[PDB]
Scaffold this active site. Structure first.
Site, PDB file in Angstrom:
ATOM      1  N   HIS G 201      43.180  22.816  74.258  1.00  0.00           N
ATOM      2  CA  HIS G 201      42.853  21.542  74.887  1.00  0.00           C
ATOM      3  C   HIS G 201      43.107  21.557  76.388  1.00  0.00           C
ATOM      4  O   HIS G 201      42.561  20.709  77.103  1.00  0.00           O
ATOM      5  CB  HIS G 201      43.656  20.436  74.188  1.00  0.00           C
ATOM      6  CG  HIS G 201      43.504  19.077  74.795  1.00  0.00           C
ATOM      7  ND1 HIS G 201      44.304  18.627  75.824  1.00  0.00           N
ATOM      8  CD2 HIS G 201      42.644  18.068  74.520  1.00  0.00           C
ATOM      9  CE1 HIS G 201      43.948  17.398  76.150  1.00  0.00           C
ATOM     10  NE2 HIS G 201      42.940  17.037  75.378  1.00  0.00           N
ATOM     11  N   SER G 205      36.859  23.644  74.723  1.00  0.00           N
ATOM     12  CA  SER G 205      36.311  24.571  73.746  1.00  0.00           C
ATOM     13  C   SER G 205      35.244  25.455  74.389  1.00  0.00           C
ATOM     14  O   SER G 205      34.936  25.346  75.579  1.00  0.00           O
ATOM     15  CB  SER G 205      35.748  23.809  72.550  1.00  0.00           C
ATOM     16  OG  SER G 205      35.248  24.701  71.572  1.00  0.00           O
ATOM     17  N   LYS G 227      30.383  16.013  61.598  1.00  0.00           N
ATOM     18  CA  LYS G 227      30.097  17.425  61.358  1.00  0.00           C
ATOM     19  C   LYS G 227      31.255  18.112  60.641  1.00  0.00           C
ATOM     20  O   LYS G 227      31.041  18.882  59.696  1.00  0.00           O
ATOM     21  CB  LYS G 227      29.784  18.132  62.675  1.00  0.00           C
ATOM     22  CG  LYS G 227      28.878  19.341  62.520  1.00  0.00           C
ATOM     23  CD  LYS G 227      28.275  19.759  63.849  1.00  0.00           C
ATOM     24  CE  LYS G 227      27.465  21.038  63.707  1.00  0.00           C
ATOM     25  NZ  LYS G 227      26.809  21.427  64.985  1.00  0.00           N
ATOM     26  N   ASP G 228      32.492  17.825  61.056  1.00  0.00           N
ATOM     27  CA  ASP G 228      33.649  18.374  60.367  1.00  0.00           C
ATOM     28  C   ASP G 228      33.822  17.764  58.985  1.00  0.00           C
ATOM     29  O   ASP G 228      34.319  18.437  58.084  1.00  0.00           O
ATOM     30  CB  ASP G 228      34.911  18.165  61.204  1.00  0.00           C
ATOM     31  CG  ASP G 228      34.918  19.007  62.464  1.00  0.00           C
ATOM     32  OD1 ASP G 228      34.310  20.097  62.456  1.00  0.00           O
ATOM     33  OD2 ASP G 228      35.533  18.579  63.463  1.00  0.00           O
ATOM     34  N   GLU G 271      45.724  41.140  47.224  1.00  0.00           N
ATOM     35  CA  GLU G 271      44.477  40.453  47.545  1.00  0.00           C
ATOM     36  C   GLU G 271      43.711  41.194  48.642  1.00  0.00           C
ATOM     37  O   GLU G 271      44.244  42.059  49.330  1.00  0.00           O
ATOM     38  CB  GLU G 271      44.736  39.012  47.981  1.00  0.00           C
ATOM     39  CG  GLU G 271      45.269  38.092  46.902  1.00  0.00           C
ATOM     40  CD  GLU G 271      46.762  38.201  46.709  1.00  0.00           C
ATOM     41  OE1 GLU G 271      47.421  38.953  47.457  1.00  0.00           O
ATOM     42  OE2 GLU G 271      47.275  37.514  45.808  1.00  0.00           O
TER      43      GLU G 271
HETATM   44  C1  HEM Z   1      54.260  24.022  52.704  1.00  0.00           C
HETATM   45  C2  HEM Z   1      53.428  24.966  52.242  1.00  0.00           C
HETATM   46  C3  HEM Z   1      53.527  25.783  50.922  1.00  0.00           C
HETATM   47  C4  HEM Z   1      54.328  25.671  49.851  1.00  0.00           C
HETATM   48  C5  HEM Z   1      55.430  24.639  49.591  1.00  0.00           C
HETATM   49  C6  HEM Z   1      53.990  26.710  48.901  1.00  0.00           C
HETATM   50  C7  HEM Z   1      54.587  26.917  47.675  1.00  0.00           C
HETATM   51  C8  HEM Z   1      54.194  27.840  46.730  1.00  0.00           C
HETATM   52  C9  HEM Z   1      54.775  28.033  45.417  1.00  0.00           C
HETATM   53  C10 HEM Z   1      55.954  27.232  44.827  1.00  0.00           C
HETATM   54  C11 HEM Z   1      54.111  29.022  44.813  1.00  0.00           C
HETATM   55  C12 HEM Z   1      54.375  29.585  43.403  1.00  0.00           C
HETATM   56  C13 HEM Z   1      53.640  28.759  42.356  1.00  0.00           C
HETATM   57  C14 HEM Z   1      52.679  29.656  41.627  1.00  0.00           C
HETATM   58  O1  HEM Z   1      52.284  30.699  42.207  1.00  0.00           O
HETATM   59  O2  HEM Z   1      52.315  29.334  40.468  1.00  0.00           O
HETATM   60  C15 HEM Z   1      53.088  29.496  45.717  1.00  0.00           C
HETATM   61  C16 HEM Z   1      52.189  30.508  45.471  1.00  0.00           C
HETATM   62  C17 HEM Z   1      51.306  31.030  46.390  1.00  0.00           C
HETATM   63  N1  HEM Z   1      51.127  30.584  47.685  1.00  0.00           N
HETATM   64 FE1  HEM Z   1      52.050  29.013  48.536  1.00  0.00          FE
HETATM   65  N2  HEM Z   1      52.965  27.453  49.439  1.00  0.00           N
HETATM   66  C18 HEM Z   1      52.664  26.912  50.672  1.00  0.00           C
HETATM   67  C19 HEM Z   1      51.701  27.355  51.541  1.00  0.00           C
HETATM   68  C20 HEM Z   1      50.935  28.476  51.368  1.00  0.00           C
HETATM   69  C21 HEM Z   1      50.047  29.044  52.355  1.00  0.00           C
HETATM   70  C22 HEM Z   1      49.876  28.408  53.755  1.00  0.00           C
HETATM   71  C23 HEM Z   1      49.475  30.136  51.808  1.00  0.00           C
HETATM   72  C24 HEM Z   1      48.445  31.158  52.364  1.00  0.00           C
HETATM   73  C25 HEM Z   1      47.870  31.154  53.575  1.00  0.00           C
HETATM   74  C26 HEM Z   1      50.004  30.266  50.464  1.00  0.00           C
HETATM   75  C27 HEM Z   1      49.680  31.253  49.563  1.00  0.00           C
HETATM   76  C28 HEM Z   1      50.154  31.365  48.276  1.00  0.00           C
HETATM   77  C29 HEM Z   1      49.711  32.334  47.302  1.00  0.00           C
HETATM   78  C30 HEM Z   1      48.632  33.409  47.544  1.00  0.00           C
HETATM   79  C31 HEM Z   1      50.396  32.135  46.175  1.00  0.00           C
HETATM   80  C32 HEM Z   1      50.247  32.946  44.873  1.00  0.00           C
HETATM   81  C33 HEM Z   1      49.105  32.398  44.029  1.00  0.00           C
HETATM   82  C34 HEM Z   1      48.819  33.382  42.929  1.00  0.00           C
HETATM   83  O3  HEM Z   1      49.619  34.333  42.745  1.00  0.00           O
HETATM   84  O4  HEM Z   1      47.793  33.207  42.222  1.00  0.00           O
HETATM   85  N3  HEM Z   1      50.890  29.241  50.227  1.00  0.00           N
HETATM   86  N4  HEM Z   1      53.169  28.752  46.876  1.00  0.00           N
HETATM   87  C1  HEM Z   2      46.218  30.267  61.281  1.00  0.00           C
HETATM   88  C2  HEM Z   2      45.890  29.003  61.563  1.00  0.00           C
HETATM   89  C3  HEM Z   2      44.943  28.561  62.710  1.00  0.00           C
HETATM   90  C4  HEM Z   2      44.682  27.277  62.947  1.00  0.00           C
HETATM   91  C5  HEM Z   2      45.257  26.085  62.156  1.00  0.00           C
HETATM   92  C6  HEM Z   2      43.775  27.188  64.065  1.00  0.00           C
HETATM   93  C7  HEM Z   2      43.281  26.026  64.606  1.00  0.00           C
HETATM   94  C8  HEM Z   2      42.255  25.952  65.515  1.00  0.00           C
HETATM   95  C9  HEM Z   2      41.449  24.785  65.791  1.00  0.00           C
HETATM   96  C10 HEM Z   2      41.594  23.403  65.121  1.00  0.00           C
HETATM   97  C11 HEM Z   2      40.563  25.110  66.730  1.00  0.00           C
HETATM   98  C12 HEM Z   2      39.501  24.160  67.313  1.00  0.00           C
HETATM   99  C13 HEM Z   2      38.208  24.366  66.535  1.00  0.00           C
HETATM  100  C14 HEM Z   2      37.311  25.299  67.302  1.00  0.00           C
HETATM  101  O1  HEM Z   2      37.493  25.422  68.541  1.00  0.00           O
HETATM  102  O2  HEM Z   2      36.413  25.915  66.676  1.00  0.00           O
HETATM  103  C15 HEM Z   2      40.769  26.500  67.086  1.00  0.00           C
HETATM  104  C16 HEM Z   2      40.063  27.235  68.012  1.00  0.00           C
HETATM  105  C17 HEM Z   2      40.372  28.520  68.402  1.00  0.00           C
HETATM  106  N1  HEM Z   2      41.171  29.396  67.698  1.00  0.00           N
HETATM  107 FE1  HEM Z   2      42.312  28.945  66.161  1.00  0.00          FE
HETATM  108  N2  HEM Z   2      43.497  28.470  64.496  1.00  0.00           N
HETATM  109  C18 HEM Z   2      44.196  29.349  63.687  1.00  0.00           C
HETATM  110  C19 HEM Z   2      44.150  30.720  63.832  1.00  0.00           C
HETATM  111  C20 HEM Z   2      43.573  31.404  64.879  1.00  0.00           C
HETATM  112  C21 HEM Z   2      43.430  32.842  64.974  1.00  0.00           C
HETATM  113  C22 HEM Z   2      43.925  33.785  63.856  1.00  0.00           C
HETATM  114  C23 HEM Z   2      42.810  33.123  66.140  1.00  0.00           C
HETATM  115  C24 HEM Z   2      42.392  34.466  66.801  1.00  0.00           C
HETATM  116  C25 HEM Z   2      42.723  35.702  66.405  1.00  0.00           C
HETATM  117  C26 HEM Z   2      42.565  31.860  66.805  1.00  0.00           C
HETATM  118  C27 HEM Z   2      41.954  31.698  68.026  1.00  0.00           C
HETATM  119  C28 HEM Z   2      41.250  30.578  68.401  1.00  0.00           C
HETATM  120  C29 HEM Z   2      40.459  30.426  69.598  1.00  0.00           C
HETATM  121  C30 HEM Z   2      40.263  31.501  70.682  1.00  0.00           C
HETATM  122  C31 HEM Z   2      39.933  29.203  69.601  1.00  0.00           C
HETATM  123  C32 HEM Z   2      39.020  28.639  70.706  1.00  0.00           C
HETATM  124  C33 HEM Z   2      37.595  28.523  70.176  1.00  0.00           C
HETATM  125  C34 HEM Z   2      36.666  28.161  71.301  1.00  0.00           C
HETATM  126  O3  HEM Z   2      37.087  28.265  72.481  1.00  0.00           O
HETATM  127  O4  HEM Z   2      35.508  27.764  71.015  1.00  0.00           O
HETATM  128  N3  HEM Z   2      43.035  30.837  66.013  1.00  0.00           N
HETATM  129  N4  HEM Z   2      41.812  26.981  66.321  1.00  0.00           N
END
Ligand code: HEM
Ligand code: HEM
Ligand SMILES: CCCCCCCCCCCCCCCCCC(=O)OC[C@H](COP(=O)([O-])OCC(O)COP(=O)([O-])OC[C@@H](COC(=O)CCCCCCCCCCCCCCCCC)OC(=O)CCCCCCCCCCCCCCCCC)OC(=O)CCCCCCCCCCCCCCCCC
Ligand SMILES: CCCCCCCCCCCCCCCCCC(=O)OC[C@H](COP(=O)([O-])OCC[N+](C)(C)C)OC(=O)CCCCCCCCCCCCCCCCC
Ligand SMILES: CCCCCCCCCCCCCCCCCC(=O)OC[C@H](COP(=O)(O)OCCN)OC(=O)CCCCCCCCCCCCCCCCC
Ligand SMILES: CCCCCCCCCCCCCCCCCC(=O)OC[C@H](COP(=O)(O)OCCN)OC(=O)CCCCCCCCCCCCCCCCC
Ligand SMILES: CCCCCCCCCCCCCCCCCC(=O)OC[C@H](COP(=O)(O)OCCN)OC(=O)CCCCCCCCCCCCCCCCC
Ligand SMILES: CCCCCCCCCCCCCCCCCC(=O)OC[C@H](COP(=O)(O)OCCN)OC(=O)CCCCCCCCCCCCCCCCC
Ligand SMILES: CCCCCCCCCCCCCCCCCC(=O)OC[C@H](COP(=O)(O)OCCN)OC(=O)CCCCCCCCCCCCCCCCC
Ligand code: HEC
Ligand code: HEM
Ligand code: HEM
Lengths: 60, 53, 32, 66, 55, 240, 380, 101, 77, 54, 109
Positions: G201, G205, G227-228, G271
């Protein structure tokens, strides 16, 4: 004879409160209608396989 | 890393800053060994041998 | 001059009740 | 009791790809059993025959089962 | 300036000692515990298995 | 050997995206498990309360819960005792620990048949192919006692006696108890045990498909309506 | 009378960030993925909050707790499969976010790009520990494999591994600490995403043309709001069609078995994003070299803002580098497939060639393509 | 050479910025020296460049291109930003050399 | 930063109409299909050759892997 | 309760709620400080401190 | 050159909120309790993170895990008692924050 979108806009869609009212009433009635229709589609697809389809030979 | 950092002025700056940078590296190393209680370094300084660490 | 600024034809995008300019609106605004 | 799986399996062995696999099976069986001391076994042609045969069964099995 | 900087230096030494001790205790908490250290160096094993066997 | 035989794609009655399970086949497979597969395999996660509403009625499920016996307690002396099971109890384990299973079944542990369809590659297809694929080994390979050849089992040597055959059990609805029918029934019952949310999940999916097929044209209509100010906007450059 | 939206401080922040944000009018469908990532983050937070409301982290009761969620908790099967497929959808939208940045030159926003790289690392750690959480065969064995990957570091590897394990193996301490880290780390992801949005910001963008978007700029409302909304709806379509029809096409079968330390699976597959990382790991046949290869393969995204030598920001008008970029996406797909496949012939040599081609095509070939394009456009 | 001009024209058509009405000096990325060049641009060239970029953004929003007769061509792709940009680069190199001294 | 002091643009005239006064889908197919075909024709030679190299590599890898599993008939004894 | 008394479901959901709520407290504290910085800080005299600040 | 502290965005936010903030010169020790509350929140976040690191939420094993933290875990008793007394002193500083608010007329905000 006014068109039905014009009548809908004049009666319900003009004021925002009436818009929200008809949105909620349509939400209730449409939720009922699609619940009935979706389940009916499901049992017509799965006739003779569901538990309430096969249920009548086990209660009585 | 870049082509703008040549010439006498930047090498003079490097010569001025290498004692300060070396002393910062020295205090970084001493802070690291003091933090981790690294026996391999702390077993040669005299008083700290009494700590056995 | 500023009078030469004329709105181009938008008839490729207009609604079916708006395509003619000899018929006034507000008989179809409610429908739209 | 007549078994629909056995009848369908017999029909699939009657089909031509499975009997080509079958004839490769008795070629390999005569090959292996001709010798006395060897460390070569052919489960692979058996796997091919079972693959083709059970694929045709899975195409034409469940019609006889309710 | 030496007196004032000696005061702030001794405070810095004190807070550095305290902070290092606290984070050392936290990292040792994340390390192994008494249960897994006790059940590590002793294995109940006998010789009631025949030759050419694995357990 | 290092080879493996991929089981084929059987045309199940629940293979479709909106096709539910055949609950008559589910209860037939439950009978197959009860007087066929419950001697060795266990089910630690399926209960008679799960049987109510899918397989049997509440009274029938309750009655088959008192047809088994469950350890419970403690009594007034602090001792465990036998009591007739009820709808809240789980399926009875054949062995208290896996080492008893290893001792009884010649060093082979039968895994829990509560996630076996979701656990094996292919699933109910794998279960059906494994149960129907028993055959004599090819000439040259030899297997010791308690081991039997199977093309679909990885390693090709399974420790399992051929569990099902023709007229191994008697059904209740008069269906012929041939070996393929018994295998199909136990396969779909294992599928239900591994996924009790099948019919409900598919009904949810049908509802979701209908509402999103209604909402995507309408939300796209709103997007094109709000964006029609820009998408038909015309530009002009008028330098002096 | 005053404008409450432009006067009240919280409303002023919301107006200057999401309501009256000057956004480029020509950004494609690839720019919805930031909002999709935020929405998937909120979905994951809520869904995991419910899962941990019904989840106990203990090696005796982790698998039983997950089974109890799937069976006896009302719609807990929907909760659990929604969490898993939402993690998969999060990684899909995250890779598309990174690819949008790579193809449109958004990495010139160096601070935003580096915060994004830190976000990507945090999401990798979160997903790894969350996959450890259900205490399956794949969970336990992937945890042991990746921790031995950590053990490949000389002279501190064994100590850090025994510190991370809470012992000398993946055990109850490891499971509970991974539960704590997996719960807490998405809130750090949310804070870093706030920092991400702030850094974006600052400068506004980017447009697909890569040009200055101040010529034709529109407010974020209601255009990109609706759009979103449409993008959120389509993402929900794909996510819950996965959930309600194919909940296990991206999962693993033998993960549904209880974790036996003595027994081992015939194959090791996490995965598909970790299959990419695993293929880059096992392309190079030494431990420390493979670990540095994986770490370097993630840090080249942060390194790429220094690798931009072309005078044109976007790949819209540079066709050779488009061919290079799609070759790059091609062997992303190839490396994912090789990480899926076991390590025998010819997958070994295919993975080695894919990894060396990947590193070459990012490090040395794209700057050459950019300078060749500048030479051909008479810019050099 | 005669082969080089045809290949350059084919590559220019493959670039695709002529289809939206741009020029090369429009499509080059806006760095610090480029910003100084645009500031040093005269008013008429600045206005034409701004209108061209605005029309390009509108066209890419609409996912359309200009008609074939209205595309710009290789022969009249004037390099208006080239002398200003070259002078800014020369002045910055002079400042860099003085900083090196 | 915000609107008003973003860019300096002179002599540019913009025309637009009401969303209610125009159509949301103005000839959605008759010019929708040729524009999609034009965009695919422009950007189809940059993605399809890498993707068919992926398909060829995938098929050749599967075929060579199956021949690695295939039994060698060289050893007869 | 998740049932009819405080039991395992209640304890687990209370663990989840007690884990999550301090971060909501932190976000509300950010809002707290934003409102405070908008309105300025107060002095013990209750007067305008704008004449003398550090 | 430029002033990084007030030109870098995160740095200028931190500078405008905590470094160059115009504060009243005469606020007594009762105004420290807001920062005391914030540091209480940070300390409780860290200590409870360690407690949930070594804690299991099950009615059969909650007390067993508490005992394991108290005895088996290195300084786990210190972390647990630090969490409990930190919560109590957090409420002490909350009550003093509220008392300052009622006394010195801070409720006009
Ligand atoms: C506040 C956020 C989150 C909480 C409290 C949370 C909690 C949990 C818990 C309790 C489990 C075990 C339950 C189960 O597998 O049956 C689980 C599994 C898992 N979580 Fe999260 N999680 C969070 C965010 C995320 C995020 C951000 C990701 C990935 C980007 C993620 C990826 C996974 C995966 C891949 C599994 C395993 C699912 C599987 O084995 O099929 N979680 N999570
Ligand atoms: C993991 C959680 C992430 C969240 C929640 C997030 C969130 C966001 C959001 C809301 C925007 C605005 C939407 C847009 O501009 O298209 C944005 C833009 C952007 N994100 Fe992310 N992002 C994540 C990861 C990443 C990663 C992994 C990269 C690069 C390796 C990245 C780089 C950027 C850049 C460069 C922009 C600017 C896009 C532009 O200038 O048009 N972000 N991100
Ligand atoms: C094909 C036949 C129809 C046709 O030619 O339509 C022309 C039309 C293009 O018209 P145009 O005038 O050249 O461009 C202006 C757009 O229509 C202006 O609309 P748009 O296409 O730019 O809208 C932005 C985008 C927004 O889409 C998103 O935000 C999706 C985000 C990615 C997907 C979700 C993430 C997960 C992905 C997992 C893989 O929405 C769409 O792509 C439309 C979705 C329609 C869904 C089905 C409705 C029935 O084609 C489409 O809109 C394609 C989609 C619909 C068919
Ligand atoms: C950074 C990683 C620090 C690891 C650490 O504290 O290790 C303890 C040890 C304590 O020192 P030490 O001398 O007792 O142990 C060294 C021998 N190992 C590590 C094999 C047990 O500190 C280090 O190893 C210092 C590493 C600095 C880099
Ligand atoms: C600055 C404020 C704190 C100053 C007083 C505490 C100073 C300190 O560190 O005291 C040492 C004591 C631990 O002593 P001991 O266990 O003997 O450690 C030697 C083992 N290497 O340390 C303790 O007992 C711990 C005291 C912790 C106080 C600060 C807590 C900060 C939390 C964030
Ligand atoms: C899938 C195929 C998508 C496709 O059709 O891509 C072609 C499209 C061409 O768009 P463009 O050339 O910018 O022009 C638009 C109209 N002139 O190109 C685009 O729209 C650009 C798409 C950029 C992002 C693509 C991401 C693909 C997945 C990448 C995963 C790995 C990323 C790196 C991870 C490390
Ligand atoms: C970073 C984490 C490094 C790591 O893995 O540390 C674990 C290690 C465990 O040490 P310990 O519990 O004594 O086990 C015996 C083996 N040393 O832990 C240690 O060796 C202790 C590390 C202490 C670090 C102290 C940092 C002090 C910073 C002070 C700033 C002022
Ligand atoms: C010189 C070609 C001339 C073609 C003339 C076609 C007709 C032109 C006149 C009519 C206009 C038609 C429409 C034009 C659309 C845009 C222009 C276009 O398509 O140009 C051709 C395109 C770009 O050309 P250019 O980038 O200059 O090619 C340099 C060669 N590298 O180039 C291409 O499409 C060629 C792309 C070839 C890519 C081959 C990649 C092979 C390797 C892939 C490896 C992937 C990873 C595998 C794993 C590795 C590790 C194991
Ligand atoms: C507490 C013990 C007494 C402390 C004390 O010294 O109080 C007197 C002090 C006088 O301060 P002041 O009136 O500002 O005089 C300055 C004039 N030169 O007065 C003050 O310091 C006034 C502020 C005292 C704040 C702490 C006392 C109240 C604590 C409990 C508040 C509970 C509120 C409700 C909570 C539940 C809801
Ligand atoms: C006692 C003789 C059993 C009977 C009756 C049934 N099963 Fe069997 N099962 C048993 C053992 C000893 C084993 C392990 C053997 C080994 O070599 O590992 C198993 C294992 C299975 C499996 C898993 C196969 C795999 O590839 O992992 C399945 C799918 C299986 N058993 C199915 C099954 C069914 C459906 C049964 C009822 C008809 C049944 N078994 C009966 C022991 C015994
Ligand atoms: C629970 C966590 C809380 C945190 C982290 C927090 C944080 C802070 C901080 C850092 C300050 C500045 C210090 C000061 O001005 O004295 C402050 C002041 C203030 N707090 Fe809090 N606070 C919390 C709770 C409360 C509560 C419970 C109340 C009232 C019931 C409250 C009302 C106020 C007011 C009115 C001020 C302004 C006082 C002034 O400007 O002099 N806050 N808070
Ligand atoms: C991220 C932040 C926090 C986490 C992870 C956390 C975690 C925990 C855990 C696991 C316990 C059980 C251990 C025990 O009972 O001794 C606990 C207890 C407790 N927590 Fe927290 N906590 C956090 C913040 C807080 C806050 C902000 C407060 C107060 C406002 C608080 C007050 C308490 C209290 C009073 C107990 C009871 C301890 C006892 O009675 O012995 N915690 N916490």
């Amino acid at each position: 004879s006014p068109t039905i979108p014009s009548r809908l806009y004049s009666l319900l869609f003009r004021r925002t409160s009436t818009f929200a009212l008809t949105i909620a009433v349509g939400a209730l009635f449409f939720e009922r209608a699609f619940d009935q229709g979706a389940d009916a589609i499901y049992e017509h697809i799965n006739e003779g396989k569901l538990w309430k389809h096969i249920k009548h030979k086990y209660e009585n | 890393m870049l082509s703008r950092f040549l010439g006498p002025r930047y090498r003079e700056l490097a010569r001025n800053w290498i004692p300060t940078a070396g002393m910062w590296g020295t205090v970084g190393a001493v802070g690291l060994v003091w933090a981790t209680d690294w026996r391999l370094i702390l077993d040669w300084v005299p008083y700290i041998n009494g700590k056995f660490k | 001059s500023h009078t030469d600024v004329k709105v181009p034809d938008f008839s490729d995008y207009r609604r079916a009740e708006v395509l003619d300019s000899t018929k006034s609106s507000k008989e179809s605004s409610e429908a739209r | 009791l007549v078994d629909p799986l056995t009848t369908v399996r017999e029909h699939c062995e009657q089909l031509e790809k499975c009997v080509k696999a079958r004839e490769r099976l008795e070629l390999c069986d005569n090959r292996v059993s001709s010798r006395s001391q060897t460390e070569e076994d052919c489960t692979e042609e058996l796997f091919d025959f079972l693959h083709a045969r059970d694929h045709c069964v899975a195409h034409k099995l469940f019609k006889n089962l309710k | 300036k030496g007196f004032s900087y000696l005061v702030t230096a001794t405070t810095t030494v004190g807070v550095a000692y305290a902070a290092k001790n606290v984070v050392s205790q936290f990292v040792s908490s994340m390390s192994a515990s008494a249960d897994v250290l006790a059940m590590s160096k002793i294995e109940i094993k006998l010789s009631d298995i025949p030759e050419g066997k694995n357990m | 050997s290092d080879l493996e035989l991929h089981p084929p794609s059987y045309p199940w009655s629940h293979r479709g995206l909106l096709s539910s399970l055949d609950h008559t086949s589910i209860r037939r497979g439950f009978q197959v498990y009860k007087q066929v597969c419950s001697s060795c395999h266990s089910m630690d996660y399926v209960a008679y309360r799960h049987l109510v509403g899918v397989c049997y009625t509440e009274e029938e499920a309750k009655a088959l819960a008192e047809e088994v016996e469950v350890q419970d307690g403690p009594n007034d002396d602090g001792e465990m005792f036998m009591r007739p099971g009820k709808l809240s109890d789980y399926f009875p384990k054949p062995y208290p620990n896996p080492e008893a299973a290893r001792a009884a079944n010649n060093g082979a542990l039968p895994p829990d048949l509560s996630y076996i369809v979701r656990a094996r590659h292919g699933g109910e297809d794998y279960v059906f192919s494994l149960l129907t694929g028993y055959c004599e080994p090819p000439t040259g390979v030899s297997l010791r006692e308690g081991l039997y050849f199977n093309p679909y089992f990885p390693g090709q040597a399974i420790g399992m006696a051929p569990p099902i055959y023709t007229e191994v059990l008697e059904y209740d609805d008069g269906t012929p108890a041939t070996m393929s029918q018994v295998a199909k029934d136990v396969a779909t019952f294992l599928r239900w045990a591994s996924e009790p949310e099948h019919d409900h999940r598919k009904r949810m999916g049908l509802k979701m498909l209908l509402m999103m097929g209604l909402l995507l044209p309408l939300t796209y209509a709103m997007k094109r309506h709000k964006w029609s100010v820009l998408k038909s906007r015309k530009l002009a450059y008028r330098p002096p | 009378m005053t404008n409450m939206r432009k006067t009240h401080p919280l409303f002023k922040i919301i107006n200057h960030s999401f309501i009256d944000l000057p956004a480029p009018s020509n950004i494609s469908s690839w720019w919805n993925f930031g909002s999709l990532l935020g929405v998937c983050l909120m979905v994951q937070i809520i869904t995991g909050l419910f899962l941990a409301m019904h989840y106990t982290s203990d090696t005796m009761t982790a698998f039983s707790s997950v089974t109890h969620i799937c069976r006896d908790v009302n719609y807990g099967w929907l909760i659990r499969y929604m969490h898993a497929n939402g993690a998969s959808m999060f990684f899909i939208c995250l890779f598309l976010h990174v690819g949008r940045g790579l193809y449109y030159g958004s990495y010139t926003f160096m601070e935003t790009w580096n915060i994004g790289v830190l976000l990507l690392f945090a999401v990798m750690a979160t997903a790894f520990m969350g996959y450890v959480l259900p205490w399956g065969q794949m969970s336990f064995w992937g945890a042991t494999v990746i921790t031995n990957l950590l053990s490949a570091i000389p002279y501190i590897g064994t100590t850090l591994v025994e510190w991370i394990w809470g012992g000398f193996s993946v055990d109850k301490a490891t499971l509970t600490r991974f539960f704590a880290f997996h719960f807490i780390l998405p809130f750090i992801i949310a804070a870093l995403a706030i920092v991400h949005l702030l850094f974006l910001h600052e400068t506004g963008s980017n447009n697909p043309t890569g040009l200055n978007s101040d010529a034709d700029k529109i407010p974020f409302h209601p255009y990109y709001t609706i759009k979103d909304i449409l993008g959120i709806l389509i993402m929900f379509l794909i996510l819950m069609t996965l959930v309600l029809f194919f909940p296990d096409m991206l999962g693993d079968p033998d993960n549904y078995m209880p974790a036996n330390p003595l027994n081992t699976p015939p194959h090791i597959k996490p995965e598909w994003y970790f299959l990419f990382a695993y293929a880059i790991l096992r392309s190079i046949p030494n431990k420390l070299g493979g670990v540095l290869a994986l770490i370097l393969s993630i840090l080249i995204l942060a390194l790429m803002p220094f690798l931009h030598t072309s005078k044109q920001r976007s790949l819209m008008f540079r066709p050779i580098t488009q061919i290079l970029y799609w070759i790059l996406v091609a062997n992303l797909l190839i490396l994912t497939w090789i990480g899926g496949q076991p390590v025998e012939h010819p997958f070994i040599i295919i993975g080695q060639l894919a990894s060396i081609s990947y590193f070459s095509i990012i490090l040395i070939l794209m700057p050459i393509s950019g300078i060749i394009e500048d030479k051909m456009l008479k810019l050099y | 050479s005669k082969w080089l001009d045809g290949f350059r024209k084919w590559y220019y058509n493959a670039a695709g910025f002529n289809k939206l009405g741009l020029m090369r000096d429009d499509t080059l990325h806006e760095t610090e020296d480029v910003k100084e060049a645009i500031r040093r641009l005269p008013e008429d060239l600045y206005n034409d460049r701004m209108f061209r970029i605005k029309r390009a953004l509108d066209l890419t929003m609409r996912h359309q291109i200009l008609p074939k007769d209205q595309w710009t061509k290789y022969e009249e792709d004037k390099f208006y930003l080239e002398p200003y940009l070259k002078e800014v680069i020369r002045e910055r190199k002079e400042r860099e050399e003085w900083a090196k001294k | 930063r915000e609107f008003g002091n973003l860019a300096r643009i002179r002599h540019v005239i913009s025309y637009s109409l009401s969303p209610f006064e125009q159509r949301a889908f103005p000839s959605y197919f008759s010019k929708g299909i040729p524009n999609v075909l034009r965009r695919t024709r422009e950007r189809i030679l940059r993605v399809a050759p890498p993707f068919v190299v992926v398909y060829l590599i995938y098929t050749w890898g599967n075929q060579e892997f199956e021949q690695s599993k295939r039994k060698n008939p060289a050893m007869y004894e």
